[PDB]
């Protein structure tokens, strides 16, 4: 038997009532939202990384500017994040130590080098529109301070998508050196976009409580299905290409069908062992360790 | 026409040059609200740079902000030099950042009185920010002067490094007075009382000295740069470079 | 003849970048007699450069050194993302070339007997050169290993941080096997044995430890690379990009 | 009257008797060795920073080698230069420390910035061109292992600087844009490697002593002369201009005249107030402080 405490919560969740922090929970309810809205805010900041480092190589002033705006609305999406996490007791500086000593995970995608202007437009296109799909599905999320943040965050990512897009659409139309520049790109950031999605649902240990509990309200496949449905089509405009010989449209059931993702390289990339996944971590240690005497002064003078 | 595009343009590098500077601190920050104040002050800038830019390929009658940003070498590059200047810490950072505010705020407020109405709206938008760039410079400037013993000693040595290349921001050439004998520009000289005003202030609020060394260090308008800015450029252009008279 | 090319290509490039990040080094090393080790180091392995490389061109049958060189972008470098890596401090320079140097004598020692007459004579001549580097570079892992605590702990992260880019070391590929089975190229597994016998040994003598962390990061030989490459070519070409087609 | 030792020692320079390290001198000779001897050292070894600024950016695989190997070879120089001066009894490592306190100088030629590729076929050529005039001229001075380094000097630099002249030559060859860039570097090097002389004849504290010692053969303008004589005829051969109106040459003595220099120039860059002093100091001073716990590394190591 639940307790009564178990048994109403469960109630709340069948009925659609958004949990606020003050509401009951079940300890491990709190603990993986603490998880996953923790490792969300960590991807927020770790993603500044790859496009950082196209800012100052940026081909023109106008998608130079718009880069910064768009890393800029990363900082502030990664301490929104940060607010919502701490509403379940947790602390940003306790979670924040745990992402720089590999305890708690950031977004596979940002482990991977941009090594072209095009990198930087496919991960505005690709990457956050991967990133898109998955976020107007937790929109929805049972956690009220989750699901107002998702708001807030996709109504001004969306934006920056587009963006995205146009700068490959201009690449798309421009000359045959940048055309190839955009595929090759894609060739190199399609598997991984796939991959943000998470496990395959027989090989998702938080999937069972998470949808139980209404934190999750579509599957890591029923959303990557969708983001492949929604994006081919764009593919297709750019008259670009797919890296997948396996994809072909499924008339009896609607949807494309797409091929297998490297299982193999997708584990070795969540656990610390992907392209640039020692660089992205000690870049941010490194920040963090020749930042402490700024922060130590901070400190120092708010007491005077 | 050639003066008042050789100053616009002057004005358009300084912008664009520190914009570049500001770019290379992203993700890099001591905090993450740091990150977010550096990103959104460099913008503002290349907003800035973007629009003296835009002006001076009009009034040139030829080319565009990319044409200029892209396809002039570091002898055309007329960015004062203290904009130029690396990184270093981030106390370097926020000395940089502060004697350029206190500049820009002294020299904006008064070219929004300019003859030249382009160069009175463009200075009217800019105001606006290089004030807020100016709060949060001069609010770090008092944190690390006013902080440890540790923060104090780094922001004297990066005021102390910096102060030579101040010379520049009240430094007159034949193009500053002329136009400003006509009520276009501004003559810089005439910027040391109000910038003096508020950098020395700055400096003992935050418990700190104004350097002694007469300040000496010019160059930066006529194309005559410290070894930093053809790095910048290298970095900055390649792309351009190797895939000149596209779109994107 | 399109795998001789990639393979001496790959030689070549692997000499050019590391020559690159040594001329970096030029007046800012802890004495005078290394700014003058390391600038011979690099002039060595620059000629290197340039001998694969003019090799590589007459293979392809058009370009020379210095098209492949300034022409070619980050996808199309060939060279071990172990060369790529940041100078850093000087531990982090010294770890880097003597991994390297363990690896070009043992590779050269047995390049020179390949059945491709001109590289078995550009291996001749670079071995000679190999063997001064790996002497330096050994005798500076003997001194800071065993140096001071703090050399000693800095030698350690060196190597440390080094560890995973080493794998590529021993990578093959079907140009390595193919070219290998023809007696043109070395397959690089089997040049393990000997790269492990000396730097096992290097890293014992200098009283410190082999890395436990199995190393896994390869990429650079098919143009996929860490993030420092793009802003080590936007550096080196530069003026090329800006002025093509010139003589010099 | 002299002493003995004194009126020797005169009798000695009369004689065109090579000074030795274990002869009796003037005290004020010895001294002024080591200021000279150790500053054409320190000039050797700073000047490594504005070659340096292009060894990777230089334009051709053959230009970057020639470089470094010029480079190479200037860190030998100031190498056999130290060792000169410490024969007077001084020690490399004090004198260094002086140059780094700003208590020695440096040539003033090496305060000036590199801001283009041609500045390094210019150095290479005008500048070591009369880093040579003055180090040939200084083969018959009087102390023998200043005597002995100059003559090992002067056979290794004169090869580089007919390297940096077919550089400027193949600017001069090539297209208008290398042209424009061969002339602006020399508008801005020419007074500066003229200034490398010293003080007028009117004006040089050190001349009369020097002159007397025979450690100085030749006037500070006397040299200046013979390099603008030697120089004009090869900027000419490039088809270059000399940033010099009042240039011209005078039948009747048979020398080029030349314009004024700017002095207040000069003695502002002496003075540690030039284009690039503080960035010559600030970069020695950041390799020796940096190098410490390498240095205390090595002396360690050599005492087990
Ligand atoms: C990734 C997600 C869709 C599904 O994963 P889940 O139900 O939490 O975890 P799963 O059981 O499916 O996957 C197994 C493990 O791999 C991790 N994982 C799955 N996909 C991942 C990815 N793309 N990158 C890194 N880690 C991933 C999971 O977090 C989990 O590890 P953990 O228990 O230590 O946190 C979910 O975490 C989510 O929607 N997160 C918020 C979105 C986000 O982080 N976006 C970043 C882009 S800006
Ligand atoms: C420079 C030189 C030609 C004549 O100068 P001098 O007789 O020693 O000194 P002077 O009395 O003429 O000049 C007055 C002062 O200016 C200095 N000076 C003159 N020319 C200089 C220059 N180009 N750069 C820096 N300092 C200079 C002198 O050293 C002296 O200062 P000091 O007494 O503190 O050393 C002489 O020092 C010399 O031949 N030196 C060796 C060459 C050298 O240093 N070459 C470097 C290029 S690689």
Redesign the pocket.
Known sequence: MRSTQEERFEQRIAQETAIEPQDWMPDAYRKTLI??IG??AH??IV?MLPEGNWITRAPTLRRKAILLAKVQDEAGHGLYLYSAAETLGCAREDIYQKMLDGRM?????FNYPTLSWADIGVIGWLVDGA?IV??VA?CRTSYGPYARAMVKICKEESFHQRQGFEACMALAQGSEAQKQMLQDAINRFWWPAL?????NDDN????AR?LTWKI?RFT?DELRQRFVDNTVPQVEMLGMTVPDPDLHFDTESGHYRFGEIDWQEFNEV?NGRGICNQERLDAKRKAWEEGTWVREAALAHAQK | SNQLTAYTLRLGDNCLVLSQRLGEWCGHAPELEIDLALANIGLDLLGQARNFLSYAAELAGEGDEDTLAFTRDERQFSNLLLVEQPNGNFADTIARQYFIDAWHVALFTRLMESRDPQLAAISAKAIKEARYHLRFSRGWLERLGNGTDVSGQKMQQAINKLWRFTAELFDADEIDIALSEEGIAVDPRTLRAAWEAEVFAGINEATLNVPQEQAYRTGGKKGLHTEHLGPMLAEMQYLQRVLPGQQW
Chains 1, 4 share one sequence.
């Open positions: 998880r996953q490792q969300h991807s927020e993603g995970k950031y977004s596979s995608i990133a998955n976020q937790l991959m943000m999605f998470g496990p998702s240990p938080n999937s998470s999750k890591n969540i």
